[PDB]
Amino acid sequence: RIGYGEDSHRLEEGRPLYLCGLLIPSPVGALAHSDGDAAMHALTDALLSAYGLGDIGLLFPDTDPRWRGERSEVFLREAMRLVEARGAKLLQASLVLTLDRPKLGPHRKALVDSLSRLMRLPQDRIGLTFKTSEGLAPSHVQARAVVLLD
Amino acid sequence: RIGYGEDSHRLEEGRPLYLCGLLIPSPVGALAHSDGDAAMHALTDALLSAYGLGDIGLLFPDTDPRWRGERSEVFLREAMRLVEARGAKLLQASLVLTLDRPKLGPHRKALVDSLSRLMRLPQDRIGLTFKTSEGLAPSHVQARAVVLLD
Amino acid sequence: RIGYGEDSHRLEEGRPLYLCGLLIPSPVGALAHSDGDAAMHALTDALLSAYGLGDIGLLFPDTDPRWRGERSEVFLREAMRLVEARGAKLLQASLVLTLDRPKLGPHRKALVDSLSRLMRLPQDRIGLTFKTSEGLAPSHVQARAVVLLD
Ligand SMILES: Nc1ccn([C@@H]2O[C@H](COP(=O)(O)O)[C@@H](O)[C@H]2O)c(=O)n1
Ligand SMILES: Nc1ccn([C@@H]2O[C@H](COP(=O)(O)O)[C@@H](O)[C@H]2O)c(=O)n1
Ligand SMILES: Nc1ccn([C@@H]2O[C@H](COP(=O)(O)O)[C@@H](O)[C@H]2O)c(=O)n1
Ligand SMILES: [Mg+2]
Ligand SMILES: [Mg+2]
Ligand SMILES: [Mg+2]
Ligand SMILES: [Mg+2]
Ligand SMILES: [Mg+2]
Ligand SMILES: [Mg+2]
Prior knowledge:
Three copies of one chain form a homotrimer.
Chain A: E1 2-13, E2 17-19, E3 22-24, E4 28-30, H1 38-49, H2 56-59, H3 73-85, E5 90-98, H4 108-119, E6 126-131, E7 140-149
Parallel strand pairs in A: 5-6
Antiparallel strand pairs in A: 1-4, 1-7, 2-3, 5-7
Helix pairs in contact in A: 1-3
The structure holds cytidine-5'-monophosphate (C5P) (3 copies) and magnesium ion (6 copies).
EC number (chains A, B, C): 4.6.1.12
InterPro entries (chains A, B, C): MECDP_synthase (IPR003526), MECDP_synthase_CS (IPR020555), MECDP_synthase_sf (IPR036571)
Site (Transition state stabilizer) (chains A, B, C): 33, 132
């Protein structure tokens, strides 16, 4: 099975930036009702999508207390619980983060380490790449992810 | 086999919105020579791509009488005919629709039912997720699709 | 294994346009320190991503004299060397190029022929599709690519 997911958030100077489950030193951060971690949302949607389960807005509406104020790893782990319950064995996650600043290369090892631990995948099965927007979206972070299961 | 496809259309107020084969009640809709069904087009391109057959512009030009003014499901069905003639067995489709409004959640079941009927896939093999553009693309609909075959 | 990669480049009038390894006659071309071949870059990042090896800015930075000023096919061939040494067999590449002008349809045969020759894949395993940005990104070329291996 395969699943494809996307996320994006506007970025504001002076707000914390969460990506891949980590808080990143940065002059900008997501301006969103949640932690705005585009990487974990895209991955969560891709996982849900691989089983036709819906999307993060459907399964994690802030309307439910279980979801209100929570770090995005809560949503990812719930999506893994759901697909695992359906027989899935996650094999790979490959995703692209688009953002102009900050540079994520200095944080590559920690970002991949975090995804590896969160999704319980070997490091060679975490495919993380970074790009700028070349001016197309200078005030947003964007993430697009594919997952492979079985 | 895998295939990857994308489509996008300018939205304009007061035009009909078509997604996944259905009319969706909406304040806005595609500004196009097509019905502008971004989901249908992205899936068609994904299917063609999986066999290297070209893209919707090549295969379904409106300079072609069989395809001019036709609904986009006609093109999806012809793309399925072509890949099935080459021995394909579609397994799964996962796609993301990006649009600010209207909300697609209230139409989720009908949209997934439509793709399941049209591609003859079980509901758990239709992975449909929705997102807004968080202000990045307020006047467009975008779709990106992955298909898996054999 | 699967990998997903993206690239984009600003377009400017009177610069040469490189796509899939080829010069494309065009009013506009990449503004870049590289040849700005978005197709090559997205495919390279997708291959690297499939083994968790990093991205083109990590492996092929222009701070490294070995890679500065090289054509983008050089990087793609080295990515192919790296995954092959890890046991990979590339099976398929599917990618989408987004750009308003020039029209790529007249170049379709040559582009596909080039990717087939470069990746050593049969034409039915090169899935190339083209789209405009519909006004969303009129001064950029964008590429998004999925690869499948083993
Ligand atoms: N056009 C849209 C856009 C988003 N949505 C739901 O809204 C949610 C939140 O989307 P954002 O994260 O883009 O705000 C989604 O996860 C999707 O459930 C929708 O139902 N219709
Ligand atoms: N630069 C481009 C962009 C699109 N095209 C062809 O133009 C078609 C229509 O694209 P739009 O749907 O973006 O208008 C495609 O499906 C592709 O055949 C092209 O040949 N060169
Ligand atoms: N936010 C970002 C954006 C890009 N990068 C690195 O910068 C490189 C070049 O990115 P551009 O091609 O978008 O300029 C990448 O291939 C990635 O290594 C980064 O480390 N952090
Ligand atoms: Mg979102
Ligand atoms: Mg989000
Ligand atoms: Mg189109
Ligand atoms: Mg279209
Ligand atoms: Mg780049
Ligand atoms: Mg590039």
